[PDB]
Amino acid sequence: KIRLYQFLLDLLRSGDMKDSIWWVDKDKGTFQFSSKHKEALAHRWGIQKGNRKKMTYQKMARALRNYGKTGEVKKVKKKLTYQFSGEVLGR
DNA sequence: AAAATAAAAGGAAGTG
DNA sequence: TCACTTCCTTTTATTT
């Protein structure tokens, strides 16, 4: 099955939800969410997983802080900002 | 100088 | 044991 960061990385390289998520530094691997239109992206992710309840950002973001330990995606000290690890993008 | 509102944080139990 | 998911609470940041 699909992991969350791959669902995000795909949208970014897709332009699928440019309104809800966009690159901040495609180089450095930084991305950001829209404060207004983020809940719509969270809803889709939950829909692609088949969860028992509809997905919110608060819960999706919870799954993001777990990546902190494994290294895939680290939080950035800026509103609604995260960063992919080099291993996820390339070299 | 406060509120109000949103973001971040993280323990713990639940789910296939 | 993954990979989140759900819930709850508290702290921190921003915006109003």
Tab-separated table of C-alpha atoms (C1' of nucleotides) in Angstrom:
chain	number	residue	atom	x	y	z
A	1	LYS	CA	0.000	0.000	0.000
A	2	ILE	CA	0.891	3.701	-0.255
A	3	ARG	CA	2.612	5.635	2.522
A	4	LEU	CA	1.627	9.191	3.410
A	5	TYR	CA	4.827	10.940	2.322
A	6	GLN	CA	4.560	9.258	-1.087
A	7	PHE	CA	1.005	10.574	-1.370
A	8	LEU	CA	2.310	14.070	-0.608
A	9	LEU	CA	5.441	13.886	-2.775
A	10	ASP	CA	3.282	12.735	-5.692
A	11	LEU	CA	0.842	15.643	-5.398
A	12	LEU	CA	3.744	18.107	-5.285
A	13	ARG	CA	5.374	16.686	-8.425
A	14	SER	CA	1.854	16.442	-9.912
A	15	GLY	CA	0.424	19.907	-9.370
A	16	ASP	CA	-2.725	18.013	-8.426
A	17	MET	CA	-3.656	20.223	-5.445
A	18	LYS	CA	-1.634	23.364	-6.126
A	19	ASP	CA	-4.303	25.174	-4.092
A	20	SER	CA	-3.690	23.048	-0.981
A	21	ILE	CA	0.027	22.142	-1.106
A	22	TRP	CA	2.950	23.612	-3.021
A	23	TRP	CA	6.721	23.461	-3.034
A	24	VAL	CA	8.590	26.043	-0.983
A	25	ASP	CA	12.075	25.022	-2.172
A	26	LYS	CA	11.770	22.151	-4.651
A	27	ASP	CA	15.561	21.979	-4.298
A	28	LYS	CA	15.791	21.658	-0.512
A	29	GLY	CA	12.644	19.519	-0.477
A	30	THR	CA	10.420	21.879	1.517
A	31	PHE	CA	6.650	22.080	1.123
A	32	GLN	CA	3.756	23.883	2.768
A	33	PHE	CA	-0.017	23.630	3.194
A	34	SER	CA	-2.747	26.211	2.654
A	35	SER	CA	-4.291	27.316	5.936
A	36	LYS	CA	-7.696	27.549	4.230
A	37	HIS	CA	-7.730	24.593	1.818
A	38	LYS	CA	-5.707	22.000	3.760
A	39	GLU	CA	-8.740	20.119	5.096
A	40	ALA	CA	-9.678	19.147	1.531
A	41	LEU	CA	-6.365	17.339	1.011
A	42	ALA	CA	-6.656	15.588	4.376
A	43	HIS	CA	-10.107	14.377	3.315
A	44	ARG	CA	-8.732	12.755	0.153
A	45	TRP	CA	-5.864	10.961	1.901
A	46	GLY	CA	-8.327	9.423	4.346
A	47	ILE	CA	-10.465	8.475	1.356
A	48	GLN	CA	-7.541	6.775	-0.404
A	49	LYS	CA	-6.916	4.710	2.751
A	50	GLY	CA	-10.494	3.663	3.516
A	51	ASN	CA	-10.382	4.778	7.149
A	52	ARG	CA	-13.318	4.316	9.514
A	53	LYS	CA	-13.641	8.099	9.974
A	54	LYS	CA	-13.075	10.984	7.582
A	55	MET	CA	-9.551	12.357	7.711
A	56	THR	CA	-8.708	15.771	9.155
A	57	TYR	CA	-5.462	17.729	9.038
A	58	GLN	CA	-5.025	17.472	12.817
A	59	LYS	CA	-4.914	13.683	12.473
A	60	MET	CA	-2.879	13.612	9.254
A	61	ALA	CA	-0.355	15.961	10.872
A	62	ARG	CA	-0.187	13.519	13.790
A	63	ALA	CA	0.996	10.798	11.409
A	64	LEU	CA	3.615	13.279	10.178
A	65	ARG	CA	5.352	13.767	13.532
A	66	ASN	CA	5.950	10.008	13.696
A	67	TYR	CA	8.202	10.377	10.646
A	68	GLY	CA	10.421	12.512	12.879
A	69	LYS	CA	12.095	9.431	14.349
A	70	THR	CA	12.560	7.450	11.126
A	71	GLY	CA	13.826	10.517	9.243
A	72	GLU	CA	11.562	10.529	6.177
A	73	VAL	CA	9.990	13.923	6.953
A	74	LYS	CA	11.029	16.460	9.604
A	75	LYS	CA	8.971	19.403	10.832
A	76	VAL	CA	10.142	22.909	9.944
A	77	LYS	CA	9.849	25.883	12.300
A	78	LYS	CA	7.452	27.733	10.008
A	79	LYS	CA	3.663	27.684	9.831
A	80	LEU	CA	2.378	24.499	8.176
A	81	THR	CA	5.820	23.624	6.781
A	82	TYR	CA	7.570	20.256	6.486
A	83	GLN	CA	10.622	18.849	4.696
A	84	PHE	CA	11.334	15.628	2.821
A	85	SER	CA	14.625	13.880	3.475
A	86	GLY	CA	17.130	13.572	0.649
A	87	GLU	CA	16.632	9.803	0.655
A	88	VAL	CA	12.983	10.348	-0.294
A	89	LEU	CA	13.789	12.681	-3.209
A	90	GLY	CA	17.146	11.588	-4.635
A	91	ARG	CA	20.770	12.004	-3.563
B	1	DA	C1'	-2.586	44.152	26.496
B	2	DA	C1'	-5.479	41.257	25.942
B	3	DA	C1'	-8.486	37.655	23.484
B	4	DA	C1'	-9.507	34.483	20.101
B	5	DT	C1'	-8.105	31.112	16.914
B	6	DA	C1'	-4.937	28.200	14.798
B	7	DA	C1'	-0.829	25.558	15.004
B	8	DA	C1'	2.181	22.369	17.230
B	9	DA	C1'	3.056	18.873	20.477
B	10	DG	C1'	2.887	14.056	22.172
B	11	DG	C1'	1.102	9.982	25.281
B	12	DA	C1'	-1.597	6.169	24.697
B	13	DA	C1'	-4.943	2.812	22.753
B	14	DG	C1'	-7.032	1.320	18.557
B	15	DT	C1'	-6.961	-0.819	13.606
B	16	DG	C1'	-5.848	-4.438	9.830
C	1	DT	C1'	5.680	-5.287	14.291
C	2	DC	C1'	4.463	-1.937	10.642
C	3	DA	C1'	1.868	2.160	9.168
C	4	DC	C1'	-0.904	4.995	10.633
C	5	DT	C1'	-5.482	6.122	13.006
C	6	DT	C1'	-8.178	7.837	16.728
C	7	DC	C1'	-8.557	10.290	20.767
C	8	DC	C1'	-7.246	13.436	24.412
C	9	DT	C1'	-4.678	16.989	26.474
C	10	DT	C1'	-1.481	20.391	26.918
C	11	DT	C1'	1.706	23.752	25.223
C	12	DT	C1'	3.107	27.232	21.613
C	13	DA	C1'	2.311	30.337	17.692
C	14	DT	C1'	-0.288	33.467	15.171
C	15	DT	C1'	-4.242	36.363	13.962
C	16	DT	C1'	-7.958	38.820	15.285
